């Protein structure tokens, strides 16, 4: 048995829990459960590599890791220049002496 | 808001286009333009921290290639109450 | 104020930012925002000839980087008086 079960998140985190994943055992829920294009997927990765062979790429990494002007690691959302968020490009390469914000 | 955005330049074309950037970027009111002297002219604007930041970004991007260009810019966020008489 | 300016975008928000460019560029009265259908969105403004000319020039300059981007931008100087009831 070993009620403690190690399951690897889609990004690569080890969580020891009980999980909900697939197995050759109890049936009625296999039905080809592999398709994965959903935000906040709590479905374990182990299901995907063991039973599907297709590993999606993770989400829910809301933490945005930035480097403060003094070269140290800040994070928590982030309010700089996103590559895909447009209409904020101008000024990206300018100096803002004072209370740091980017 | 009370955050202090503010721009320095040489000439009034850059000064007023920086003011236009102020008033087109974010919800920021200018507390005043000033003729510093020797050609130096500055603009002082009040608004929210993110608001004044967007404003100063716009002013810097639209200012450096106008006339002589931007000379200085700075982003005071909490101006102490003792500084208000100076503005 | 009679000169009518008008533009499409392959998407709603490019049209919205186009209208933003209109109003931040020159004095314009955005009279209409219309859904063409399937994604095309039109915005139409009113103003002076040179005013709308410069406004739409700025809008087209600032539009191509927004989503799919600009699709059509040309303007008229003397609108026909019977069209606006249909607009």
């Amino acid at each position: 048995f070993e009620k403690v079960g190690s399951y690897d998140t889609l990004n690569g985190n080890n969580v020891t829990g009980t999980g909900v994943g697939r197995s050759d055992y109890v049936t009625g829920n296999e039905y080809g459960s592999c398709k994965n294009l959903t935000g906040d997927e709590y479905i374990g990765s182990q299901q995907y590599e063991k039973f599907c062979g297709s590993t999606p790429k993770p989400e829910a990494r809301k933490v945005g890791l930035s480097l403060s002007s003094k070269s140290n690691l800040i994070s928590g959302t982030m309010t700089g220049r996103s590559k895909i968020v447009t209409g904020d490009e101008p000024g990206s390469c300018k100096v803002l002496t004072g209370t740091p914000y980017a | 808001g009370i955050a202090l955005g503010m721009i320095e330049t040489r000439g009034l074309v850059p000064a007023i286009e920086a003011a236009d950037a102020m008033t087109k970027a974010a919800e920021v009111r200018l507390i005043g333009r000033e003729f510093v002297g020797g050609g130096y002219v500055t603009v002082l604007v009040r608004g929210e921290t993110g608001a004044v930041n967007a404003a100063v970004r716009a002013g810097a991007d639209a200012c450096e290639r106008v006339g002589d260009g931007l000379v200085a810019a700075h982003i005071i966020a909490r101006p102490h109450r003792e500084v208000e008489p100076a503005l | 104020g009679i000169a009518l300016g008008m533009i499409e975008t392959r998407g709603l928000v490019p049209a919205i930012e186009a209208a933003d460019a209109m109003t931040k560029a020159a004095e314009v009265r955005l009279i209409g925002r219309e859904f063409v259908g399937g994604g095309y969105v039109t915005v139409l403004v009113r103003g002076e000839t040179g005013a709308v000319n410069a406004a739409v020039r700025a809008g087209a300059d600032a539009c191509e980087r927004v989503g799919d981007g600009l699709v059509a931008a040309h303007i008229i100087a003397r609108p026909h008086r019977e069209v606006e009831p249909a607009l």
Partner: peptide, 22 residues
């Protein structure tokens, strides 16, 4: 001078001058 958008870049009129104006 950044994207045209807000500020026109180097729109000459007769001879040389940028005359970007507003």
């Amino acid at each position: 001078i950044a994207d045209a958008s807000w500020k026109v870049g180097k729109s000459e009129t007769d001879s040389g001058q940028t005359v970007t104006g507003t």
